[PDB]
A paper describes a structure:
Here, we report cryo-EM structures of human H1-containing tetranucleosome arrays with four physiologically relevant NRLs. The structures show a zig-zag arrangement of nucleosomes, with nucleosomes 1 and 3 forming a stack. H1 binding to stacked nucleosomes depends on the NRL, whereas H1 always binds to the non-stacked nucleosomes 2 and 4. H1 contacts DNA with L1, the amino-terminal part of α2 together with L3, and α3 to stabilize the nucleosome and contribute to chromatin compaction.
Nucleosome 4 is not stacked with nucleosome 2 and is increasingly mobile as the NRL increases. H1 that is bound to nucleosome 1 always contacts entering linker DNA via its helix α3, whereas H1 on nucleosome 3 uses α3 to contact exiting linker DNA. In nucleosomes 2 and 4, the entering linker DNA is in contact with α3.
Author numbering:
A (entry chain k), F (entry chain o): 37 to 133
B (entry chain s): 35 to 109
C (entry chain l), G (entry chain p): 20 to 102
D (entry chain n), I (entry chain e): 30 to 124
E (entry chain m), H (entry chain q): 10 to 118
DNA sequence: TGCCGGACCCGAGCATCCGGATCCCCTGGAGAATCCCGGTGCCGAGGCCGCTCAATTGGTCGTAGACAGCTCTAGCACCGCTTAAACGCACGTACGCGCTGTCCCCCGCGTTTTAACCGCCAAGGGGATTACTCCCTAGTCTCCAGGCACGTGTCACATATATACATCCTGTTCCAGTGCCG
DNA sequence: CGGCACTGGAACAGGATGTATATATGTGACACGTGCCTGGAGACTAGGGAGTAATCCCCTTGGCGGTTAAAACGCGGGGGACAGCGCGTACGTGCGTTTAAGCGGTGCTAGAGCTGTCTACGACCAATTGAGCGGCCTCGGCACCGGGATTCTCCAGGGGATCCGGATGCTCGGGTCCGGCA
C-alpha cells in the first residue's frame, strides 16, 4: 500500500516544527488589507507605516497563540483533544473578555 | 395492545445475530425502528432485559447490567 | 482601495498553523469563525485607539510608536518597534 | 483642632441633590466615591501626562484631555462626556 | 479697585472646584504649564460621571426602598452596567457583595 | 419521620442568601491572627490599623469569591457540578498566576 | 510572641460560605487546605509590599493607605479605604 | 583654570550615562528636585538587570550554537526563568516565538 | 542633516562584551533591549513619582528607588540589586 | 324385540383474559423557610457656625506652540511573473458523546465544644505636628568629548544539497484462550 | 471432560519517510572607524526641602469575663463522579488543484518633518475674602425584633399500567344419544 501516517503523528510533528520556528504564519498582504479595512471604519485618508503593520501582525499572533495554549490546557482539563469554541468563550470570560 | 416486552426484546436480539452481542444502543434502535415506546418504557425494558438475563434465556456478552452487549443462549 | 471581505483574509490553514504553534491537536470547524470574531474585537479596539492617536498626532500616516501605545495601555508590551 | 482635610463630599452631595434631591448618603459610600474620583483623576491625568511626553508639549490643553477621554471612557460615555465638556468649555470661554 | 471675584466653577456654572483640581494638576508633577479650560473640562466630565453613577445608584436604592445609599447598591449599579463594569473590571468594592448569579445547570429538575 | 431536606437545596438557599448579603464570613479575630502571623515574618512589632485589616479582608475574600466563580465555571465546563483542585490549578494558570 | 497555626483558624464553614457566595455547590474534602495555601500566598504578596511601605514611610504601624497601594499595584482597586 | 571633564558614570564606575538618565528624569517631571545618588542607583540596577538577562541570552545562544544573539535567543533565555515570568509575564517579544511545550496527554499510550 | 536620536544599543553592546566578548547581536535585538531599558525606566520612574506624591516628597533620592525596586523585584534579584546599587552609590559618595 | 353402529354431546386442551403483584406517576399532606407588616430605640448624617487659606484679580512678561514655508521620503499604486500555499474533497478512524453500573463522600441533621465578640479598661508607642537650620541641587556660565550619523567592509549565517539516522506503522511469526467435537 | 482446530493477541523486522548533519557559497547587515556638537560636566549661588528635637495624645494592643452561635465530629446515604462500552462523525491525512501573495521594479506625492516668527496665555506674586472644613446636634430613617403570610419543597399514597399465572370457555375429539337393523 501507499503509506499513511496515523492521525496525530503529523499534527505533533507540525507542533514541534512551529514551536521551533518563530516567523509569522498568516500571509502579510491579506492581513494588511484587513488592517486598512478596519482603520477605514474610523477615518478615511490614512497611510500606514509598514513597521506598524508587522507590529500588529506579531502582537496579534502572539495574543492568539497565548489564548490557544490557554484553551489547549482548558480542553486538557475537559478530558478532550478536540477544541470547541465554548472553551474559548470560557477562557475569555474567566480571563475577563 | 401488543405482546409483553419479552417478545419484542427477543426479536430485537434475534434480528441480526452479530458476531459480538447486540449492544444496548443497537437493540434500542431496533425497537425504535420496529415501533415501541422506548421513551417511557425504558426502565421497563431495562428491567425486562435484566429479567431475561436472570432467567438465562439471554446471556450478556461483554458488559454487566444494561451496558455492553447481549446475545442469545447456547441452545 | 475599497475593501469588503478581509474577514476571510485569515485562511483556515493559517489558523491550523497557529494552532499547531499553539499546541492544539484537534480543531473543530466551528473554531475559525469564533476566533475571527474575537480577533476582530481585539483589532477594532487597538486600531480605534491607534486612529485616536494619529488624529491626535494630526497625521495621515500611522506610526508603529502609536502601535506601541496601543499595546501598552493594556500591558501587552512588545519590544523592538521603536521603543 | 486638626489640619484641614479636603473632601469632595460637599460637591458630590450638591451633584447628588441635583440628580436625586430625595436620597441621603452614607459616609462609607462617600469614602468609596472619594477613592473613586481620586483614582480616576490620577488615571486620566496620567494618560494626559504620557500624551504630554509623546507630543513633546509643555502646556496641557483641553484637546489632549478630550483625546484621553476617548482613551479611557467606554463609548457613549466618551461621546456624551465630550459633548458636556464642550459646552462647559464654551461657557467658560465666555465666562 | 478689584472686581468681584467669581469662581471658575461659577464661570462654567458647575459644582466642582476648578481651583482645587487645577492646583492638584500643577502640584501633581504632570506639567509646568496647564491651560485654563482643561481643569474646567475635567471638572465637567467628573461631574458627568458622578451624576451618572449617583443617579443609577439612587435608582437601585429606590428599588430596595432605602433612601440612604449603601455600598451594596453601588456594587449593583457598577456591575449591572457593562460600560461601567468594563471600565472598572479590576476594581474591588467593600461590603458591596456581588451580583446574584445562579447557574441554571446548578438548578434541579 | 423527622424533617430532612435533600442535598444541595439548602446549599442553594445558602448561595442565594450569601449572594444577597455582603458581610464578612470569616470570624475576624483569626484573620488578624493570620495577619500578624504573616506580618512578623517580614518585620516584627508592626502595629495595625483595624481599617487596614478590614481592607485586607475585603480584598482577600473578594479575590477568593471571583476565584470561586471561576472555579465553578471550570467545574461545570468539565461536565460536572463538584469542584476538585484541578479546577483551582487551571484557574491559577489561566489567570496568569 | 510568635504565631504558629492560625491558618487552621480558617474554618471550612467559612470556606464553604465563600463557596456559596462564590456560587460553588458541591465541594470536595481536599479543597480547603489548598485554598488556604493559595490565599496565604496572596497574603504574603500583599503584606510584603505593605511592610516595605511602612518601612519606607518610617513607621511601625500599618495603615490602610499603604494597603490601598499594596492592592493597587496589582490592580485590585478597593474604594472606601483611600483618604 | 577649570577641572578636567570627568564623567559621573566613571565616578560611579558605570557604563550607562547617568547624566542622560538624570536629564530624562528632569524632562520626565517626576519631581521638582532629584538627589544626586538617585540616577546613579537607577543606572546601576539597570546594568544589573541587563547583565542578568544578557547572561541568560548568552546561555541560550551557546545552547543554540549561534554567535550573534537573536530575538529567539531572547525568548528562550527569558521564558525558562520563571522569576522573570513573574516580572515580565505581560510582555510580548517580536519574533521570539514560544517555548516548545507539548503535554503528555498529547503523547500516545 | 539628520536628527540625532538617543539609543542605548552601544551601551547594550558594551554590556554584552563585558559579559561575553565573543558574542554579537542583531539590530532588532538591540531595539528590544532599548525597549526594555525604556520600559523598566518608565515603570520605576512612575512608581517613584507616586511614592514621592504619597509622602509629600519633592526630592528623589536613591532610597526611594531602592524601596521601589524591592517592591517591583521579587526574589533574590531585589536583594542583589539593592546590594550592587548600594556599593555603586556608596563609592560614588566617596567620589 | 333385542343389537349394533352413526352421531352427538360431554370431557380435554389450550388459549385467553383478567387477578393480583408490582413498578411508575401525578397530585395532595406536611413542614418549614422566607418575605411582608409594624414596633423601638438608636446613631450616624445633614445642617449650621465659625474660622481659615488658598482661589481669585491684576499685572507682567517671556516663551510654547501654531502657522508658513520648504523639502524630500516612504507609502501608495500599478504590474509582471511565479511558485507556496489555499482549497477541496475523500476515506478512515478514533474521540467525543452518551448511556449505565457502582460506590462512597460530602450535604444535611444532629450533639458537643469553644473561642469570637462585646465591652470595658489601662498602658503606652509611636505618629504627627511645628519649628529650625543647612546640604544639596536647580539654575547659570563656560567649556569639551563621546554618541549619533554615516560610511564601509566582510564573516555568521541562511540556503542548498547530499548523507546518515529515528521513527512510525504495518506485515509477519510465536503463542495462549475458547468452541465444538472425540 | 479433553484435545485440537480456530481465533485473538503480543513481539519484532523492516521500509519509508522525516529529522538531523556536513559542507559549499554569497551576503549584507553587523561592526567598527570618525566629525561634530550639543548635551554632559565644573563651578557659584540661592535658598529652601527636609532631617531631626520635642510633644502629646491618641490610637493600638493586651487582659478579663461571659456567651453564644459558630464550628467541629458522627452517621449516613444518595447522587454525582467515575468506569466502561459502543458508536458515528468530523477532522487527519493525503492527494489534486487555484490562486494569490509576494517580490521586485517604477513612478508620485502627500504629508511629515525641520525652522523662523510672534504672540498670546500661563506662571508668578500682592490682597483678600468667602467658601470649605471641623465639631456638634438632632433626628429620622433604619437595623434588630417580633408575628403572620406566603411559598417552595419533599414524601405518602392512590391511580395507571403491565405481566406471570389461574380461570374459563369454546373448541376438539370420544361414551353416550339415537335409530335403523337383524
Amino acid at each position: 500500500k501507499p503509506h499513511r501516517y496515523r492521525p496525530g503523528t503529523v499534527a505533533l510533528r507540525e507542533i514541534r516544527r512551529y514551536q521551533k520556528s518563530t516567523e509569522l504564519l498568516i500571509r502579510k498582504l491579506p492581513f494588511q488589507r484587513l488592517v486598512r479595512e478596519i482603520a477605514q471604519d474610523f477615518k478615511t485618508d490614512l497611510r500606514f507605516q509598514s513597521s506598524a503593520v508587522m507590529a500588529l501582525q506579531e502582537a496579534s499572533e502572539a495574543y492568539l497563540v497565548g489564548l490557544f495554549e490557554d484553551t489547549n490546557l482548558a480542553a486538557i482539563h475537559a478530558k478532550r483533544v478536540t477544541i470547541m469554541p465554548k472553551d474559548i468563550q470560557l477562557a475569555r470570560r474567566i480571563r475577563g473578555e | 395492545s401488543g405482546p409483553p416486552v419479552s417478545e419484542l426484546i427477543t426479536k430485537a436480539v434475534a434480528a441480526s445475530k452479530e458476531r459480538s452481542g447486540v449492544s444496548l444502543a443497537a437493540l434500542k434502535k431496533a425497537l425504535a425502528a420496529a415501533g415501541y415506546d422506548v421513551e417511557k418504557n425504558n426502565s421497563r425494558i431495562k428491567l425486562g432485559l435484566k429479567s431475561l438475563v436472570s432467567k438465562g434465556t439471554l446471556v450478556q456478552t461483554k458488559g454487566t447490567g444494561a451496558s455492553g452487549s447481549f446475545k442469545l443462549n447456547k441452545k | 482601495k475599497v475593501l469588503r471581505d478581509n474577514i476571510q483574509g485569515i485562511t483556515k490553514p493559517a489558523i491550523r498553523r497557529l494552532a499547531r504553534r499553539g499546541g492544539v491537536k484537534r480543531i473543530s470547524g466551528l473554531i475559525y469563525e469564533e476566533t475571527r470574531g474575537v480577533l476582530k474585537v481585539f483589532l477594532e479596539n487597538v486600531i480605534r485607539d491607534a486612529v485616536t492617536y494619529t488624529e491626535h498626532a494630526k497625521r495621515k500616516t500611522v506610526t508603529a510608536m502609536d502601535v506601541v501605545y496601543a499595546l501598552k495601555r493594556q500591558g501587552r508590551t512588545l519590544y523592538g518597534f521603536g521603543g | 483642632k486638626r489640619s484641614r482635610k479636603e473632601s469632595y463630599s460637599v460637591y458630590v452631595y450638591k451633584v447628588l441633590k441635583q440628580v436625586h434631591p430625595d436620597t441621603g448618603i452614607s459616609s462609607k459610600a462617600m469614602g468609596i466615591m472619594n477613592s473613586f474620583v481620586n483614582d480616576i483623576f490620577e488615571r486620566i491625568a496620567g494618560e494626559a501626562s504620557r500624551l504630554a511626553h509623546y507630543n513633546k508639549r509643555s502646556t496641557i490643553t483641553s484637546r489632549e484631555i478630550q483625546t484621553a477621554v476617548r482613551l479611557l471612557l467606554p463609548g457613549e460615555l466618551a461621546k456624551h462626556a465630550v459633548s458636556e465638556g464642550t459646552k462647559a468649555v464654551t461657557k467658560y470661554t465666555s465666562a | 479697585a478689584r472686581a468681584k471675584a467669581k469662581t471658575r466653577s461659577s464661570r462654567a456654572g458647575l459644582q466642582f472646584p476648578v481651583g482645587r483640581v487645577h492646583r492638584l494638576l500643577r502640584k501633581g508633577n504632570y506639567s509646568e504649564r496647564v491651560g485654563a479650560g482643561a481643569p474646567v473640562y475635567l471638572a465637567a466630565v467628573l461631574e458627568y460621571l458622578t451624576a451618572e453613577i449617583l443617579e443609577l445608584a439612587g435608582n437601585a436604592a429606590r428599588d430596595n426602598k432605602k433612601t440612604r445609599i449603601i455600598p451594596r447598591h453601588l456594587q449593583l449599579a457598577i456591575r449591572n452596567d457593562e460600560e461601567l463594569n468594563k471600565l472598572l473590571g479590576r476594581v474591588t468594592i467593600a461590603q458591596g457583595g456581588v451580583l446574584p448569579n445562579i447557574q441554571a445547570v446548578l438548578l434541579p429538575k
